[PDB]
Structure formats: C-alpha cells, structure tokens
Assembly symmetry: D2
Homo-oligomer: 508 residues x 4
Amino acid sequence: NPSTTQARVVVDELIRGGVRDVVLCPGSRNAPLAFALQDADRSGRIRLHVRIDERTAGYLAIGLAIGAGAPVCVAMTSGTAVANLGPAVVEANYARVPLIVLSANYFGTQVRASISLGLAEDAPERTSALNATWRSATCRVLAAATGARTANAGPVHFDIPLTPPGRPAGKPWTYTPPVTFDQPLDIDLSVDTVVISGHGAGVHPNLAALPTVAEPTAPRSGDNPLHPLALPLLRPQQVIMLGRPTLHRPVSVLLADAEVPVFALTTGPRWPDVSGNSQATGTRAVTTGAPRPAWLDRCAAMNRHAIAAVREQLAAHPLTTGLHVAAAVSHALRPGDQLVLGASNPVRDVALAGLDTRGIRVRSNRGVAGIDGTVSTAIGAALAYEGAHERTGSPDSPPRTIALIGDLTFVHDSSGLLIGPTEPIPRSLTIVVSNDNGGGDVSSRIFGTPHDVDVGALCRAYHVESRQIEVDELGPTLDQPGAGMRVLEVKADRSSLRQLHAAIKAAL
Amino acid sequence: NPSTTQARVVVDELIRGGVRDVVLCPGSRNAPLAFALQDADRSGRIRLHVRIDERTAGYLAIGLAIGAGAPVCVAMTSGTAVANLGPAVVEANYARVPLIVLSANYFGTQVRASISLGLAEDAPERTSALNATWRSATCRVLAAATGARTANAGPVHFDIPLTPPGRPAGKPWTYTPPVTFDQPLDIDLSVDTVVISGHGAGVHPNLAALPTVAEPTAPRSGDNPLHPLALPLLRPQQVIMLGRPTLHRPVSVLLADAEVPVFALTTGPRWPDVSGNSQATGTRAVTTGAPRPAWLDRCAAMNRHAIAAVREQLAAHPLTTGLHVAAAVSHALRPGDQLVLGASNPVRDVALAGLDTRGIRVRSNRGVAGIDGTVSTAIGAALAYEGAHERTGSPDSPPRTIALIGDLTFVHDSSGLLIGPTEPIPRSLTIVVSNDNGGGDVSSRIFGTPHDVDVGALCRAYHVESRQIEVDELGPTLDQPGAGMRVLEVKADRSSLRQLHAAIKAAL
Amino acid sequence: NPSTTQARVVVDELIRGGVRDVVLCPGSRNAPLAFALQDADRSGRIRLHVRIDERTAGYLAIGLAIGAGAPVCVAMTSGTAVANLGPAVVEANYARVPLIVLSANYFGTQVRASISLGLAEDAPERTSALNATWRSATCRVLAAATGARTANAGPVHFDIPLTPPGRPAGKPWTYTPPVTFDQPLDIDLSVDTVVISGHGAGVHPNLAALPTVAEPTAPRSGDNPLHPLALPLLRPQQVIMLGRPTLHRPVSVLLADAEVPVFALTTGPRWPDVSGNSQATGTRAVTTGAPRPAWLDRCAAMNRHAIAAVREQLAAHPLTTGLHVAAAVSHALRPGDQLVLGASNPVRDVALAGLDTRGIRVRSNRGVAGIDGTVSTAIGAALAYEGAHERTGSPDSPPRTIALIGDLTFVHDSSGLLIGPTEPIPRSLTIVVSNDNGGGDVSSRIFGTPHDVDVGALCRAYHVESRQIEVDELGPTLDQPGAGMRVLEVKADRSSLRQLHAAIKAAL
Amino acid sequence: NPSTTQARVVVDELIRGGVRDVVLCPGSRNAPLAFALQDADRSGRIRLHVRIDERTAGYLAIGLAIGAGAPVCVAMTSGTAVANLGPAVVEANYARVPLIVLSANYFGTQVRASISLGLAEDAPERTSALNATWRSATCRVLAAATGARTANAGPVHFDIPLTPPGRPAGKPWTYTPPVTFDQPLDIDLSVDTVVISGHGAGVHPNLAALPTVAEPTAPRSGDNPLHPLALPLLRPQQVIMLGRPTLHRPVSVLLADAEVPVFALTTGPRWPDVSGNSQATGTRAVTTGAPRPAWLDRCAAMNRHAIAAVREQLAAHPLTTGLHVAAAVSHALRPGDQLVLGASNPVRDVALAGLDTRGIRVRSNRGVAGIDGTVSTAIGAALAYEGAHERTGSPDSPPRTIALIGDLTFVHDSSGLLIGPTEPIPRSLTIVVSNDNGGGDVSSRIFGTPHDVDVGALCRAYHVESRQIEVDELGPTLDQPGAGMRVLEVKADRSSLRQLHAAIKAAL
C-alpha cells in the first residue's frame, strides 16, 4: 500500500515533467509503477504501449521520443529485461534521446544517471518529506534525461524498489529553466570554407550563406547546398563541422586531412568526434570577413554538376535500384512530412539523391546506426508526431510519416508490426520497403545470395496492408488513402549497382 | 599480417579445445579471427553459421552448445553487438552453457572470465613465446567456459585486439584432466523423503528408489516418479533437492516450509537456490537406512491418482488445449529423440502431462526462461545433435529434434527461421507450434485479445514447410518425412482452460 | 622507441594544457610517460613530486590542484596503485577537482572520462595523423578534467598502453574557449530571504546585501554575514542556496523544512543536493524587489548576538579548547593568506568562531570530508600557491599557507611529511595541530580514551620543525620566521567542551 | 528495531561460521550490525578491533585471517570507506584470504560474491522465514569467502541495508562439508625434474624426494631443498610448479623456457599463472618411475655450493646488510614461531639466506606484494595466532610472532602501531626493522637519498618499545622478554650491496 502511494507520486511527477508515452512489457514480476501507470492511462494523462519483445519496446520508446522531442519511459518486469533493452539504450546514449528506464529490483556508462528511490515506508508523520523526496528525485531523473541542465540528453535508469500533491497548477516539483550553453569561436569566413552538418547539428544563421554538405537529419541553416559528391572535387581551406557527421566517405577523408583546419560547433558539450585536426570547439561562431564570390561560384557550380550526374544516370538506368526508390521518396515529400530513414542504405541513398530537407522532420537512428527496431522507431515516431498534431487542435488529417527501409531491416524488425488491438496504432504511417535482397569478410557471403522472403506474405501474417508498387507509382501512392499503417514494397535490382555507380563516376 | 598469425593460432587452439561450431554476424568492422575462421571452415575443421540478428546468433550458439555439450563461439563485429548478445549471455550464465564470445576492440559478472589477448607484434625472435602465450590464453578461455577446473560452465568474453604449431597429435596446449568435485552428505533415507530434481541435476544411483518429482530437463536417477500434483497431497519429512528446481508451485511451497529440512545436492559449487531452509549442501549422498514401504506405497498411489486425474480430464475435454498438445508430443517421443521445450507453457505443460523422459534429451532455456531465441535454440540444438550423430558413423537417418513452443514465442522468434542457402540447416527438426493466442497487472491486457497472426503465412514468408494438424494426427505426422525444418501448427483453445483445470482439481 | 615518441607528445600537450605539477610513485613497472616526464622536469616545464604512498600521492595532487586552480596529473606504476588512489579520486569527484590519473595497462563512475590511447606503432608514413590523434585525445582528457565544456570539473583516467610538434606558440591542439553556463531564475527579494553559501558557491553581486550564512570555503558575495547559530532563531520565508552546503545542523534543519521554498544556484549543472524542497534550480538570480529593512535589521541584530555569545564564552572559559585554537588562527589571518582546514572539527570550529574570509583563500576537502591526506593536501596547496606567486615576479616573501588540523588527522596523515631531499618542499607552510586526543556506536570508545601520541617526537622523527605553543602565542608565532614547513602544536582540553557549549547556549 | 533483529541474527550466524575477529572504524554513519557486534563482544563471542584508518583496518583483518586461517569481517561506516579498503581487498583476492566486508548502503570483480540482505521488515507473521533467509544468506557469504564449495577463498561484500534462533548446538544454518577438489595428473619422475613451490602450494608426499625450490611461504613436502641460486646452474628436463611462484628471477627464466615442460599443480581451480608452456594442470600427481640418482646427486651438490657461497660471502663482508639481518632472523627461528615477511626485500632476502621453514608459519602478503599494511598484517597475524594458542588451553607463553620489514615499509605503515588502550594488543610480537634507507626510471631518485627518519623517535611517538640492536645480538634479543609489541631496529648498509652480490657471484 505505501509502495502504491510512492508509485502514484512518481507517475504524477513524470507526467508533470512532460512524459506523455510509457512503454510496458508483460513480465515475470509486477511492473514498477504499474497500477499507477494504467490509472494515469485510464484518466487520459498518458497512454501506455504494450509490447512483448523488450528490445522492440526500447526502439518504440526511441521513436516516441524523437517524434516530438519529449521524454519517454520504459518499465522493466523480467530477468531478460535489462539485457534486452541494451541496444536501444546504446542508441539513446549516442543519439542523445531522453529515454527513462524504470526498474524495480547494470547499464553502466551508457546512461546519464542511475538513481534508485527509497523504499516506501509506512510513516504518515513525514508524508510531506517523503513526497518532496520522491518528486525531487523524479525531477532529477527527468532533468538528466532531457539534458535540462547539461545540454546532453540521454537515457536514465530510475529504480523504484518494490495521494500527496505536487506543485500547484501542474508544475514540476523542482523547476529547471532553459539552459544556455555558450562557447563562442572566432572564425574568418574569407578563408575558403565548407560547412559539414551532421547528426545533432544546431542552426547557425551567420553560416547560412556558406557551402554546406548536410546529412539528411541535420537541420539546414541556409540555402547553399553542396552535394557530398562535389566535396572531393574541391579544396576547402577551412571546415566548420556542425554536430557529428559520420555518413560520407569524402567527408571522413576531408575531416582527417591534417592540412585543413576544422572548427567543431556542437549544441552540447560532448567532444568533437571524428576529426583529429579540430583546431577549436565551440557552440557558435563569431564571424569576420565573408566568403569569396569565386569560392561560392565554384562550389555552386560543383554542386549542380554532382546533382546533374546522379539525376541523369538514375534516369538513364534500365532497372529500378534502391537509389531510384530513395529518389522517388525524396521527390514525393512536402513540408509537414516526417521522414524516418533506415540507418544503413536509406540515409545514404537519400543523401546521394539530393533530398531537400527544408520543412521536413527527418529521423534516423544515427547514434549507433543499427537496423534493429527501425520499424518500431518509425511506429513510435509516427504516434508521437500525430499526437502532437492532435494536441494542436487542427482539424486537418494527421501529417504523413514515411519510413524508408531495406528488406533486410524490415524482415529482421517485422515483429515490431505485432501490435495488439488494445494498443495505439499510427494513423498515417507508410513504410516504404526497398527490396533488393541485400545490404551495404566471410560474413558477406549471405549478401551474395537472396533471402527470398515473401514480404507480402510477411505483412499478411501481421494483417498489415501491403502493396507491391513500381517506383513511378510511389509518389501518387504515398498520397493515396489507406490503413493507418501500411507497407509499400518496391522491388529493386542489386546486380546492376556497380554499373550504375560506374556510370555516375564516368559522368563526374 | 601478424594479426593474421595470431588469429590462425587462436582458431586452431579453439578447434583443439572441442569447438566445432562458430556463429558470426556481418558487421561494421572486420570480424575477430574472421579470415582464420572461414579458412578453418573451408578445411572442414569447423562450420560457420552466419546470422544478421546478433541476439538470434547468441541463442543459435546456445542451442549449438546444449545439443551435444560442446563449447561454442560467437564473433562480434559492430557497435550494437555487445548489447544485442546480452540476453543469450544471461541465459548461458544461469544455465551454465559454454558460450565463448569473441571480440576485437562490458558483460560484467555474467561471464566466467573476461580475457584479452596481447596485440600481435612483429617479432620473429620470439615466435615460440607468442605462440605459447596465445594458446595458453585460449586454453584459459576454454577451461573457464567448460568449467574444466571449476565445474561451473558458463559464458566467457575473449577479446583479440586488431602458422606456429600447437601440441602434437591435435592435443590442447594446456591439458586439463576431468575434475572431480566431491562434497559428500550424510542422509538417513528411513525418514520420509521426496527427491525434487531440477534443471542441472546430477544422477544419483543410491537415490533411484525414492519418490522423485523431476522437471523435464532433469535426468532421472530411477523409476519411482511422483507427479507434481501429488506433492501438495503428501507430507514429506525430508526433501533432497537436486539441481535448481523452479517449475512447480507446490515445489516452491514445500521448499519454503521451515518445518521440512532440505538437502541440496548440486553437480557444481553454486549455492542452493530457492530454499532458505537448506540444512546442508553437497554433491552426493552417503545414505543410511531405507524408505518405509508404507511411504513408498503412499507416494506411488498418489502418483497414479494424480496421473489418472490429468489424463482423464484431458480425454473428456471437448476442445484441444495447449495441454492436449503437450500430451500428444510426449506420447509420440521415443528413445533417441531430442525434445526442445519453450521456457513458458511447454515445459510446464509437458510436466503436468507426465512425460517419461528416459532415453530423451530434453532441452529448455530454464536458466532465465525467456521466450527469446527458442526457435534458434531449437535449430542450433538440432544441428549440433545431428552433427554428433553423423560423427558416430551410423548409416541411420538423423535423430529427431522436436520443439514445442507457443504461438507467441514462435512469432517473436520467427526471424530465427531466416537462414541463408549458404548456411547449415537441420535435417530432422520439427517445430510444433501450440497456437492459442496467449501466454502463461495491466500488461496482461494483450493476452485477453488474440494477436490473430497467420502462422501459416508467416512460415510461407520464410519458405519453411508448415502444416496445420489436429492433435490426434500429431504423433503420426511427427513420423512422416518432410523438409529438414518444418512447422506443425496445432490450433488450441484458450477459453476453456479454467474449466479444464477446475475439472482436474475436482478429480483430485 | 615509438612508445617514447608517444609519451613526449602527450606530456608536451599536457604542459600546453596548463599542467605544471605531476605526482609520481616508484612502482613495479616503468611509469607511463616516465622518461618524457623527467625530461620535462629537467627542462623546467613541469616539476615532478615523488611519493612512496600512492594514497598520499593523490591527496598531494589534490592540494596541488586546489592551491592555484590548475589541472594536475598522477602516474600509476604498480598493482596496488588503482586501489590506493580510490579515496583521492572520490574527493576529486565530489569537490570537482581536475585530477588526471595516468596509467599504462576500474574507477567506474567517479571520473568524468576514461580514455585510453592507441599503442604507439612504427609508422613514419602517418606521423602527422598519430600526432593529431594523440594531442586531440590529450585535450579531450584535459577538457573533461577542467570542465572546459561541461562546467563540471573532476578526475579523469587517461591510459597510455606501453618529436612531432604541437600547435604554434605553445597553444593547445584543440582550443576550448571559456564556456558560459547560464540558467537564470526569477527571485523576489522582498520576501524574507537568507542566503546559504556552501562549498563550490559562485559570486552573486545582486545578492550581496542579503543575510548570508557562508561556509568557510564559500566565497563571499557581500558584507551582511549571518552567523549559523543565529539561523535557528530566525524564520526566513525564502532560502537561496549557493553551491553545496553541508556543514551546519541548523542549515540541514532549515533546508529540510517543507514550509520554506529553496532556490538552488550552482556554478555547474550538478543537481541541487541536500534539499528535497528545492523549488527551482539555476546559475544566477534575476531579482525583483528588495529585502525589508526590518528583516535586515533583525538578521543583523541576531548575527551580532550570536557572535557576541561565542566570543564571550570563549574569553571566559578557563581552558584552551579546539574552538579557542580555531578562533586564534582566524584572528591571525590577513589578506593573501591561504587557509587549509581539516574536514572534521577545524572547518566547523572556524565557522563557529566567525571567520571573516574576505581576502583569504580557504581550502578544505569538503567533497567527501575525510581526514585522509589533509597534511599532503596542505603541502600540495602551499606548493601550488607559492609557485603561482613566484610566477607573478613579485620580490616579496611567499604568501603564508596555514593549515588547521586535529591531532587525530595529523597522526594518521603524518607520513605525508616524509618528503625526500630530491622533492619540492613548501617555503611558507605552517601546520597548526589542535591536540585534544579526540574527534567530532561502539566505535566511539576510542575517543573516550587518549591516543597519547607524542606529536613533538613524531615531527622529530620526520625532521620537521615543531614547536609547542600556547593559544595566545599562536598569532605572533604565525608571523615568526621558521622552516619552510613547520608544525605548531597547541594543547587543548576536551573534557570541558560540554561545559563550554552549554555556556554558549545559556548565553543565546 | 527490526533492523536490530536482523543484525543480531547475522552476527550470530557469522559467529557460528567461525568468525572470531571483527574490525571496525568510526564513521559518519552508524556501523552495520554495530549494536549486535559489541553485544557479541561484551559476551565474549567475538572481539572487536577499532582502527581509525580504514586501509589499516583491512590489513589488520588480513593478518587476523592468515594468522589462524579463519574468516574475518570488516564493517564500513563512511563515504571514504569503500575506496580506503580497495588495497586490502585486492590482496585478499590474489592471496585467497577470507575477508568479509560488511556495508549498509563497488568492489567489482575482486570479490568472490556481492550479496545484499533484504531490509528488515516489521512482520511477526513470518519471523521463521526471515530468520531462515538471513542465516542462509550469511552462510552463502561465509562459504564464498572461505571457498567452502569453490576451493577458491577470497573477499566477499555483504551489504545489510539500514532473537530468532539458529540451528541447535551452535551449528551453521546451512552446513557445507569439506570439499575435495581432485584433478590427477600423470607425471614420470624418471625425467630430470625440479619442483618449484610458490605461494599457496599444497603438500605432496609423493614429490617429497625431488629437488625443490620453495618460496618462504610455500609449505615443504620433503627435505631435498634446492637453493634458487643453484637453479640457473642446472638443466631440468621437467618442472612441477606448485602454487603461484613469483619470487625468483631464475624461476621466471626457467618457467618461460619453451624447451622445458611445466606441470602446474594447484590446490584450487585458478589457472596456471606465470608459465606459458604449462603442459597440463592438476591438483596432484600420479607418478611413475623415480628420479635418477645422478640427477639427485647433482642437484644436492649444487644446493650445497649455492648455500656455501651465500653464507661465506655474508660472513666475510665487513658491514651489516639487509641480507645479514634476514639471515640472523632465519637462524633465530624455531618450531612454533610465526614469521611475517615484508613483501619486498624481506621475503627475497630470507629466501637467499636459505631459511629452513619446517615447523614455521611463514606469512607474507604475496598476493599483490605491496608494503602497505605490513605492520598491521603482522599485528593481526600475531593476535590471531596467539588467540588460537590460548584456545588450546596450553599454559605456555604464547608463541612468538617475528616480523621482518624494511625501514621504508615500517615508516609508511607506522600508523598501524596506533592502537587504543581499548583494543587488543599482541602479547609476543617483535617487529625487526632492517634500516638501510632504501628499497628494492626517475622515481628511483629517492632511493639514492636517505629518508633519514629517526625510527626510535617514531616508536617513542607511538609509545612502542624500540631497541637499536646489532645483528649479532638479534638472536639473543629475540629470546629476551619485553613488551607485547616491540620494534628491534638493526642499522644496515646499502652502499656495499653491489660489492656483496658481486662477491656472491664470484664465489659461484
């Protein structure tokens, strides 16, 4: 009964801290906060999501967090629960995702904090102090997860071993104002500069005019794009690196060039990543000078050249490839869309196809870039994005969430489609499966051979709408009404990829 | 190149230590020992198994280890690899499975040892000493995994950071003889005694005549069975507990009875588990006296009564339940079979149905009892068991491996069926899926509702033979020829389970 | 030889990062960076300090860090080295001290980072990239230790497993500008407010007029002191807590009062500590209103009352107590002094005696408040403070470092006085030992009995100047010339302490 | 109050498990089991030892454990307590010492087990089950510490977070019989064999006739000694290694000779240590054949030669060296003595001087071989050895405990002499301090210079009897009556050591 009083206080404070979604798995033991959780679900203060696979649950929670930017909880209930959530916790660490893991008695350094509540004790004499202690600890967990004081969001472990009021007007027990992390850096823009924008990059208005190689998940500061294929054809004297870029081969080459100084600008304190020649680190630039017009003209000309080369070789290729599918999805997007990209080929293919990400919410598990949970991540991101839209009060249909994943990723996370009728289901999620039987050392011997999985039969097993579509129909079909969740499968060829990429190189 | 010399030495010593199967996943980085591994595969000294899902790989390796009792390696190649192998490592710890995890730079206390090789250095002057160092370290890993000196087998982490001969006649570099762990315990059998035999129990000839409640995975010392339903109807004055029993409600009740002394006999040193009233611990019994004939008569009569009650209520029930399926499988078994049981309902249902396990190799992930990887465990156990049979030189068809799993377990580990044509596939594995849409706190709300997954469509997606069969046809169908892997689905009712179990209680 | 090239690069970058002092112990194995270290010592770029006791070495390094605010390294060389440095690492964590621990192959969560260099490899082809990699990693360690990006200084573990130029003009390889951590908090000063200033507090000009209970190590923002004995006699409606206050019983009472809202202002992001009723957290206050004159008058009157009570009962007491010694030291201080306080009685006694800390550098290991290493901390702080003074170029005698410790602390850290003639020794360190045979549960049974250690004989054993002095001579003797290190022992009574504190309470 | 019931049960079960001595430090918090502990002390069931230095406490506990072979507890009470006990825990791990660390809420892999009790709950309804649970957990801790089932004794962490009867006749709750760990190994003694006996070696009657190089702490199986200086002058074809030998340079050379097969015989399961050419491992030998008489004659002649060379160069040397002191102590010993050796020079010097260890209990912290706590180890070993003698009922004076340590070790652990009048003090401990100002890389620069500590003044500070004695008076003085604890200081020369060792080599 006191463990009941404690749980209701914790759940109430989590709700006050912005937690709207909680993920739960059936377990050997009663869940932490379980009766308090479904009571909050019954009263509409949160919504529970139940999954059987604990690894699935973590990636669902990741999607629920990245879809609208809120902290999300997962509650553990079994002897396999810690181990099964490992992968999502690693992703949440590297991608700085506010994932709160609830336990009721091992994650080591992956979490921002590991905090255990005191057991609930029968003592009406000090209900005031227990209530303050519990809500203060909950705000501690929330702050560590959201990076409210550290500007370094990430997963937190919150153990509760197994109703007094919170603050007035639904306020959090301990309020933490917006924190401003400032580290200004002098940069002279007259030196030939390229901006490399990676995962987690901030927005820099004073850099908007510079040639920018932006990863799909990086927000764009301006409108002077530089295609990644143009970069090896250029000789920048200076590089401004935003966030953590990892995608492109020519970026890794350039960032490792001791001849070229790199200025790393991050939104948080975590150390510049992949360049050993970082000259300095900061959060923003204090600029002098301006780029040479000849430098801008040369970069803009190289961008158009690289863009034309990819677009023309795609158009002239006789077979639909995964790159054609990525280009088709990119062309079909429009402001308001949420795009969820598999961390392998989709994110790279969309970058090579030259996606204009302005107006688009692009999500990809670029933290550790596994294919695990991509389906559940897309489902979670759709649910969280649609929930934010409904909260707006707009009468419109929910915004589209479009996921692009390969067949290997889809088949290995297909169990993420198993959602009970008792559970929330997206209203406007379309998963585009680029099916070529492949990926992208003896382990590669499986890639040389098709898995030959019947994707349509797989979707029918889960009673998810599936349609086999040609790449030219993808755009129109993405506008067509259908089930709240549906899979659009596009057959793609893998045998002509070397021919296609050789044609691109021959056109450059 | 020196890192190549090191890898070939390590792989050769692993082979000398009894490693026949190695599991590998495609990864961001080159695999540890990878070129040495496939070279050993090419020369037939081992066989590689490639999987994409790293969690799948671990449970496949578990099955490959428990099928014939040999040490098995898994080689890690990605940033998601440590986290994805957590669950299988926990199982290997609690089930004492010799699972060797290979890395090339976090498992904490789950492993018996965490050993890192020295980097391979260019130094022909001391090839003799490097070779001795590497092979000695490999025997260290092997011994820790197999419990060669500790009698406590389990997982080991072996890091190799990235050809000189071993001993003559294929011998291991450092030989470890059979270790005999002896802890004799005086027990007077004249006191009314019941034997409770759990997972990991040893064989005790001097206890064979006693009434024994044996879990399906426990080896039988004798032929005086006591059905678990008979136990609450009896008043033993003394309990001899073998291994780690966890299955039965009346066993937990009895083992927790402070009035009843418990003598724990284990094959290894790990501490008596679930009884707080363990009077003593040992490895074997030094017995005096003999059980009263009246005690044996009473236990044997209670056993027949409990057996008759379950069998009669099953026969009279109008609908096929999961218990009917478990009873059908048990009746179809014969000496030489390997039985693989899902860790939830199957192991309990087979126990309630009264399976005679003599002559049968019964496997179940009873270490932590998750449903994860049950399909891959069954596949691995079949492959290892059939490989041992082929090594025997017998011209016979391979022995049958029969797995019994629920539909929930099958659907959540169905991706274990995704095996490339380049990979080993069992010859005589039949997975029996007891499909009732259920399992066995708000998380349970999904159990009240069917998943409604089309299991036949799921198997067709993976191109695995599937047949929908009635429980009376199960026995004959299990004898029928088919694909090397096949699924037999038996539809079962979940709505009449309370009626069925009330009928059992009313007959007791 | 390559491991030599690596070490010289690391040491050079550490020097560029502000490391002036390195602590070293003789060990089973060659020290990390050892030949590079003494070469830097020979060229005057750093100075090495050699100690035999590894725990002593850590506290010496702490003092060397807190004396002038610089990062300090300790280099490990034995199988006892990790365990022996534990206590200083815990202190460095809680006190946010930039302590860099160097190893050459376990500290867990106590360190800000655990970073291992790559082994030095023979490869002139990429000396440019190795040099950038090593110096970048060193700046990473330095930044984590100093909190250059996190504003959360602390210990770091830096493993180097066992000359290319750095930046021009001695600059660090990766520059990190001053980081500004900002979290403004609205506070209305018209509400009756008291400021509680603890260890690690910042300076707040807009709070200078408020009644402030400041711990001895807290910097003073203003000149409106409130004696801690006055606090229970007052009824503040609001508390502004700066830093982490832990000292005073009435502070813990007030901070735990649910009726009183607490606003926590910290210089870094670490979470408000000892109050469960923290209403909000920030880094600075945005104030409105002003304190009532009646509130200021009442607090100032209560302060004078509490001050007079302590001073008068001390003057009238017939025996010298530890409190008399603390008051004598406080009265003898003057701007420019460094005061080092034992973490037990000295810091509390100096607070009760009402020390005016303006102009004084007050150090105390208030992180975890052990008595371990207080002598070596004082020695290290003196050496670092005097080294900063010499760098100034002032012809004056070095500033005084005065340490106040109890006899128990002195005897248990007396081996810190063992400094070889080959090692740096302070020029103006005076350790005042308040000797009453006591401290301040069956463990307390030793306090009831004197240790009876001859402190003078103890100092003579270490050939440290020692003088037995009466409390009235302490001030004049602290001005008298003597050895660079000397101990002034003041005999104090412990039997009349209850009488003295009862007299204080009777005067309040 | 329930936390009181729990503590009394735990302490009672610890006493039933053989715990006679408990070590305690005054702390920030109430000690775990504290009131139960002193109550057991008051009733004479245990004796408490109070120390202020937590590192001192651990080494005192080590000595209390190795003196008579019993499990010993240490109870932690402060925020510095975990870190300060690290070094003793490492020693206990490597030396396999049954050290039980009690906490009341981080040691990682150093401990055999980390076990936390359930909080004491107010529930008379199940006092029977709580009592069984607590006593069972205590026997679990005890068994893990003593290696009762694992034959691998070591430290254990036992957390109790903060009277029902145990078994009849003072028996332990869960009894664990003597465990026999058996791993027989075939060895042919006709091959030229030498036995190398190290720390932790067992006794092997069937090996007693073989030439044996025994470390001082190794028990002797026979009477055919081989001086370590004779080993490089011989060419054994086979080596039987007992325990973990680490002392001698020529042993490390021989054990690393790939040409020579090594058979490792250990009393427990831990893996053969320092030889990479271990051919096999076991616990005992099954022998065939017999050594050649010519081989025995050659080894015996080489032993006499090496013995004569050391003895003659010592006798002819003009100055007393540390080796002379070690030889003087060895010659003064007699059956019944306990010898405690500093882990640096003393253990090696006594080996070089050729000590006959038959009848002698030789202790040395050879686990990690630090000098820390050698004084407190000697004190603890004396107290435990004398307590066993008193339990025998013999009217004789207690047996002598003689410690041999260098001046560096004595000065750095001199605070171990600080023992309150409230605490147990040995009756017959004599510490012999071999004082030459030295030990045995820039860290060595302190060895070239004397510390010049006045050891006599140091002892007077602690009011420990100290006498400055010439090496020829050591034997007679060791027989002379004195205080229960006394220090005998022998001045030794360090400048003529190279001359002395060159004279030894010139005589070989």
